[PDB]
Amino acid sequence: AGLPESVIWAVNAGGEAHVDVHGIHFRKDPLEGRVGRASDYGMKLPILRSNPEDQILYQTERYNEETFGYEVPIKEEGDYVLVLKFAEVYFAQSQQKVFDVRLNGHVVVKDLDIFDRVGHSTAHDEIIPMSIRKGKLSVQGEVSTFTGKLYIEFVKGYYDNPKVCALYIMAGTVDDVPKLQPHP
Numbered sequence: 029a030g031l032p033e034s035v036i037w038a039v040n041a042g043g044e045a046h047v048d049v050h051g052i053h054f055r056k057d058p059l060e061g062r063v064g065r066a067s068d069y070g071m072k073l074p075i076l077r078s079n080p081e082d083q084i085l086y087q088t089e090r091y092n093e094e095t096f097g098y099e100v101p102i103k104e105e106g107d108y109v110l111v112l113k114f115a116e117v118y119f120a121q122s123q124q125k126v127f128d129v130r131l132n133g134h135v136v137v138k139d140l141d142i143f144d145r146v147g148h149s150t151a152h153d154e155i156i157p158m159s160i161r162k163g164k165l166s167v168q169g170e171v172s173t174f175t176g177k178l179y180i181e182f183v184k185g186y187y188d189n190p191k192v193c194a195l196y197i198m199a200g201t202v203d204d205v206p207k208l209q210p211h212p
């Protein structure tokens with residue numbers, strides 16, 4: 029199946045619905061009023077590297093001073109890819125904001141420092157392939173029992189607060205995923 033048809037679940041964190049240049053519908057945030065804090069602070073800033081019709085995705089966020097996450101129902105077995113979108117709209121030095129990302133307890137991104145990787149007010153995406161088959165989740169070579177729901181967690185450490193800007197899951201493999209342009 030082609031791209032928009034292959035997307036099973038997608039969220040614009042801290043914001044309203046938005047359809048991107050690829051036809052992907054990022055839904056209004058289901059955690060509004062529930063857990064964490066929404067911020068539109070980035071709406072004052074141009075976002076580098078992102079396509080300009082879609083910068084609203086990176087200008088809105090959900091963050092928190094304690095660990096928080098999203099629960100995702102997955103109906104059918106198959107191969108999937110999770111895409112996580114971020115931007116640093118406040119700090120402009122390394123080791124100011126740093127956090128881990130976990131999937132059903134497995135640490136899939138260790139010590140994420142958005143500024144260190146891309147700079148200030150600039151798009152950064154993480155791309156995480158996975159498989160759900162024979163009652164198991166498989167990610168980065170580790171395997172555990174899958175019950176029907178995936179728990180995506182952003183973990184509080186010592187350096188400022190965990191955050192996320194947007195996220196989506198598509199059926200397919202990594203070669204099917206649109207990539208951001210190369211960046212120094």
Ligand SMILES: OC[C@H]1O[C@H](O)[C@H](O)[C@@H](O)[C@@H]1O
Binds near residue numbers: 067069091118188191
């Ligand atoms: O709202 C502006 C900023 O407030 C806090 O510093 C948050 O930890 C940060 O993620 C956010 O970008």
